[PDB]
Amino acid sequence: YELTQETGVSVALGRTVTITCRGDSLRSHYASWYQKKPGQAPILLFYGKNNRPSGVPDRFSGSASGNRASLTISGAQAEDDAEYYCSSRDKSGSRLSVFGGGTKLTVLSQPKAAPSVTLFPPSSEELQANKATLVCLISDFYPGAVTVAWKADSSPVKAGVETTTPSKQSNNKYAASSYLSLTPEQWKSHRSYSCQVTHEGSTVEKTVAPT
Amino acid sequence: LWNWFNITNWLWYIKLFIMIV
Amino acid sequence: EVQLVESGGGLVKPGGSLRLSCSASGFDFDNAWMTWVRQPPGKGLEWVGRITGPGEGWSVDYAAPVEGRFTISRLNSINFLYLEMNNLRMEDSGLYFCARTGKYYDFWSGYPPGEEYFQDWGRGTLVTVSSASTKGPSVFPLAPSSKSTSGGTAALGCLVKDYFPEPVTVSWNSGALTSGVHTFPAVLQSSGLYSLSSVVTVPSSSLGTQTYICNVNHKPSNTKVDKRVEPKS
């Protein structure tokens, strides 16, 4: 988790786009960059200061400065639509290596679509079984990259969160869901809980409260 | 059959020297 | 002509062991550094560990989540890289790749010990760590709310919780209600169990007069559930 990359970035066909990788180790070390498509082996795109391997189109080039490494794609093609991973040392001087979280690069095929978001509180029935789940349903969005954050009153909550990777619905937009597991006591003790969905730098936040 | 770690340190140490001088 | 082929993936109980193998051909294997990399389904790549060459004395490094549990090894006459994992966890589940690993250091701008990179890859072998016991779902109603929906309509649902394995099917009112149903793909939880939700958007004025029932079916546990979904009172 020492290398941070955008969750999603989009680009129109033929245009130019840049993904970032970020960590403290990048002040000391270069990053390598990898393309990854479902059911296929990663492909090394670029590494070190100026190194593009044989076979990789010239439109791919990496750079670096400060704590940042940037992969730039100049003249984006359909086939560039993929996930992109950066890799370097986790920390300066380390013999270990780490991957960034991945960026979903969308080469745009339709216009942008904002997610619908529905947030359900725990049923009484589930509370009676001594459990509590909040259900945040997210649909009809494009590109297929969202970030979901939960809040107990105003505090970030990370524990008990399970969130699907987005997948395509029959209409070609994406759906996802996030679940927050709590104890009934946590549910009853807070004034509210919130589900916050970030899509292409816009945010929708829904809030529920015990009845 | 040299040592990548030792060699890279060696080179790092030599660059400091060159930079100081 | 570089060919990397991983082998040994399969279902394992979450206290168990597994040895993985990576066959190599098309390059000088005896001197090559090799790295193992994993990817859980629908998720990111994670560096597992790396064995160095002669002159590093085949020294081996490991990501912190696998120290002591995982052991990287190799046999050079037959060009085979190896990965022995013991005391597996559900976290260890994923597509495991072996990668031919170059080393990079720029004299003028570099810092020791430079960086490593993955020039060639196999297609990987699939490792599933789950304590496979059939588990039937608990179904809870998701009571109607109009906040998020279009004028005059309401969304209501069923949460289908903690089942194993896939799949479950969900219908509404015995399949008489198809219009406006969205049954979401399941999440696979860290507990190794699945949950999903199904929601239907319906006329708000029907809430007093029309009964809504989600028919949940989990064939692997032979469980059927018909959950009536009422408005909160």
3 state SS of B19: helix
- The three-state DSSP-derived secondary structure of C165-198 is CCCCEEEEHHHCCCCCEEECCCEECCCCCEEEEE
Q: Identify the DSSP state of A91.
A: S
Residue C107 makes CB contacts below 8 A (sequence gap 6+) with: B11, B15
Is A79 an 8 Å CB contact of chain C? no
The closest CB to that of B8, out of C55, C108, C114, belongs to: C114
Contacts across the A-C interface (CB distance below 8 Å): 148
| Tokens found for residue A46 | 């670029």
CB spacing of A97 vs C47 below 8 angstroms: yes
Q: Identify the DSSP state of A25.
A: G
CB C95 within 8 A of CB C41: yes
Please provide residue C112's backbone torsions phi and psi, each rounded to the nearest 5 degrees: -70, 150
The C-alpha atoms of residue C149 and residue A199 are separated, in whole angstroms, by 19
Q: Which residues in chain B are immediately followed by a break of C to N over 2.5 Å?
A: none
CB spacing of C118 vs A49 below 8 angstroms: no
Pick the CATH number of A1-109 from 1.10.30.50, 1.10.132.20, 2.60.40.10, 2.40.40.20: 2.60.40.10
Q: Which whole-number Å values give the CA distances from C56 to B9, C31, C89, C171, in the listed order?
A: 14, 10, 31, 61
Burial class (CB in 10 A: 0-12, 13-18, 19+), C24: buried
Chains that touch C (3 or more CB pairs under 8 A): A, B
The C-alpha atoms of residue C170 and residue C220 are separated, in whole angstroms, by 14
Run of H or E including B5: helix B4-20
| Pick among A21, A40, A98, A137 to test the C interface (most C CBs inside 10 A) | A137
Q: Which whole-number Å values give the CA distances from A178 to A134, A139, B20, in the listed order?
A: 8, 11, 56
Neighbours of A82 (CB within 10 A): 20
| Tokens found for residue A208 | 């529920």
3 state SS of B11: helix
The closest CB to that of C199, out of A99, A133, A137, belongs to: A137
Report which residue type is found at A137.
Answer: L
CB spacing of C110 vs B12 below 8 angstroms: yes
Interior angle at CA A85, CA A84 and CA A90, nearest 5: 165
Burial A5-36 (b: 16+ CB within 10 A, else e): bbebbbbeeeeebebbbbbebbebbbbbbbbb
Report which residue type is found at C166.
Answer: E
How distant is the Cα of B18 from the closest Cα of chain C, in angstroms?
A: 10
3 state SS of B3: coil
Domains of chain C by start residue, with CATH: 1-131 (2.60.40.10), 132-233 (2.60.40.10)
**Resolution in A for the shown PDB structure?**
2.4
Q: Which residues in chain C have Cβ-Cβ distances shorter than 8 Å to B1? A: 53-55
| Tokens found for residue A42 | 């990663």
| Tokens found for residue A57 | 């189109």
CB spacing of C111 vs B4 below 8 angstroms: no
- The three-state DSSP-derived secondary structure of chain C is CCEEEEECCCEECCCCCEEEEEEEECCCCCCCEEEEEEECCCCCCEEEEEECCCCCCCCEEECHHHCCCEEEEEECCCCEEEEEECCCCHHHCEEEEEEEEEEECCCCCCCCCCEEEEEEECCCEEEEECCCCCECCEEEEEEEECCCCCCCEEEEEEEEEEEECCCCEEEEHHHCCCCCEEECCCEECCCCCEEEEEEEEEEHHHCCCCCCEEEEEEHHHCEEEEEECCCCC
Neighbours of C3 (CB within 10 A): 12
CB spacing of C142 vs A135 below 8 angstroms: yes
Q: Identify the DSSP state of A121.
A: P
Domain with CATH 2.60.40.10 in chain A: 1-109, 110-211
Omega within 30 of 0 (cis) for the link into A57: no
Q: Which residues pair with C199 in a beta bridge?
A: C157, C182
- Sign of the CA dihedral with A22 first, then A24, A26, and A31 last: negative
Give me the CATH topology for the region A110-211.
Immunoglobulin-like (2.60.40)
| Pick among A5, A6, A97 to test the C interface (most C CBs inside 10 A) | A97
The C-alpha atoms of residue C66 and residue C88 are separated, in whole angstroms, by 9
CB spacing of C105 vs B9 below 8 angstroms: no
